[PDB]
Amino acid sequence: MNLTELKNTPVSELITLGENMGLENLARMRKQDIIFAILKQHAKSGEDIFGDGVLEILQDGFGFLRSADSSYLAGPDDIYVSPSQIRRFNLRTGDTISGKIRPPKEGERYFALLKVNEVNFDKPENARNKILFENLTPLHANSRLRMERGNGSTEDLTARVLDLASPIGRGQRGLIVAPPKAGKTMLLQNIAQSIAYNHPDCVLMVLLID
Amino acid sequence: TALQQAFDTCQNNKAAWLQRKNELAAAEQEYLRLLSGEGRNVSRLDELRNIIEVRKWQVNQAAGRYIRSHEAVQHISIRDRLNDFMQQHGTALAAALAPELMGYSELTAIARNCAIQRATDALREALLSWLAKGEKINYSAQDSDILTTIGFRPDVASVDDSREKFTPAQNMIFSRKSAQLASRQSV
Numbered sequence A: 001m002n003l004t005e006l007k008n009t010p011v012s013e014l015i016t017l018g019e020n021m022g023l024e025n026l027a028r029m030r031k032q033d034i035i036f037a038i039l040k041q042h043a044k045s046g047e048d049i050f051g052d053g054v055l056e057i058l059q060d061g062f063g064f065l066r067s068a069d070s071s072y073l074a075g076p077d078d079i080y081v082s083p084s085q086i087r088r089f090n091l092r093t094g095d096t097i098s099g100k101i102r103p104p105k106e107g108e109r110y111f112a113l114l115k116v117n118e119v120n121f122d123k124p125e126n127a128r129n130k131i132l133f134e135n136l137t138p139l140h141a142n143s144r145l146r147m148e149r150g151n152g153s154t155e156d157l158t159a160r161v162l163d164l165a166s167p168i169g170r171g172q173r174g175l176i177v178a179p180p181k182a183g184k185t186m187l188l189q190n191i192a193q194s195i196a197y198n199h200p201d202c203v204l205m206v207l208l209i210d
Numbered sequence B: 001t002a003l004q005q006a007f008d009t010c011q012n013n014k015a016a017w018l019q020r021k022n023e024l025a026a027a028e029q030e031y032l033r034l035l036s037g038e039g040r041n042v043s044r045l046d047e048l049r050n051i052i053e054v055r056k057w058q059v060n061q062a063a064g065r066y067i068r069s070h071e072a073v074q075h076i077s078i079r080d081r082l083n084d085f086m087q088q089h090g091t092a093l094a095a096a097l098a099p100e101l102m103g104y105s106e107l108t109a110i111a112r113n114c115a116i117q118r119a120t121d122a123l124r125e126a127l128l129s130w131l132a133k134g135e136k137i138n139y140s141a142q143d144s145d146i147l148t149t150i151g152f153r154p155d156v157a158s159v160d161d162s163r164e165k166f167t168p169a170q171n172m173i174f175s176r177k178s179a180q181l182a183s184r185q186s187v
Ligand SMILES: Nc1ncnc2c1ncn2[C@@H]1O[C@H](COP(=O)(O)OP(=O)(O)OP(=O)(O)O)[C@@H](O)[C@H]1O
Pocket: A178, A179, A180, A181, A182, A183, A184, A185, A186
């Protein structure tokens, strides 16, 4: 199988299928440990497995690959990446990777990478010929993002007045000043879902800390 | 020889105005068909509205500069025709206004201005007397073709869109938006 479907599933069906295939007493451990054991058993069986995620490099090239669904936890399921392919493909932190993953052997406890079929939703050779982010020229928000869905939702009002107060454009720097108990979280999730509804093309990411 | 320059300036102004008109028509028709279409991209609709307004501003400016070019070429043609006409039959004209033209060199500013005003009143009364009978005429023989090809007056389509006046801040922001549009469409 692939890590994509394994990660985004409740542990119920995961543990049931692990027991049906049969690994161990696979109830009292972490979800990452369960996934690691299932992947180890599948690799021992002999079937090839794909892998995908987001890559990060340490200060010595000891590359790791995490998953967005698991909130970038440093679990055993993270894919090990040696500096050799990092230098060969000229990749850096933040490059989405997907391809064949090498099962771990003796001497290491992390899944390795056999080959990469694509990088950041692009061919590995095509994505190499790209400039860094800081080499671009900033420009004002030419395009306009409208929070009006057009369906006349009864709860859409909080978004509507926003368009009457603060227009939203692509590539702008937004700040919100809010005291505690101001309903800012619901406003932010309303904005996020309105963006996902009106503009499905643009990639939406919502970051939460502490 | 500035008449030919004015003529070609009017010609290219008309060409640019036609280009702006047809591109505005294309933009408005595609905006209307997208409105009638099943697509619901609100960002596309907003950017199309921006395109429509900037194209309307460009059409208005093109009409304004075309009107300026047309009045300039008409003034140049009138000046040249009157200059050769006075070089042809100016002595009789001066004789007809002799009682207020003798010794113009030594006349003071007020006297010269009053004499000029009286001469203008005399020629104005002559012109109105001539126009009372309504004697139909045609264009000047030497430059009839230019007058015919530029028209007696610009068409309504060039003034109906030019009846709206923009504040200077509006002109500046529209110029910036047009520059941004050109920069974004060049790539
Ligand atoms: N339009 C509304 N109608 C009803 N209740 C509302 C409305 N707007 C805000 N609230 C109330 O405001 C409360 C504020 O809680 P909320 O979690 O949204 O706060 P916050 O400003 O995001 O910050 P924090 O969670 O840190 O307190 C909500 O529990 C909700 O009941």
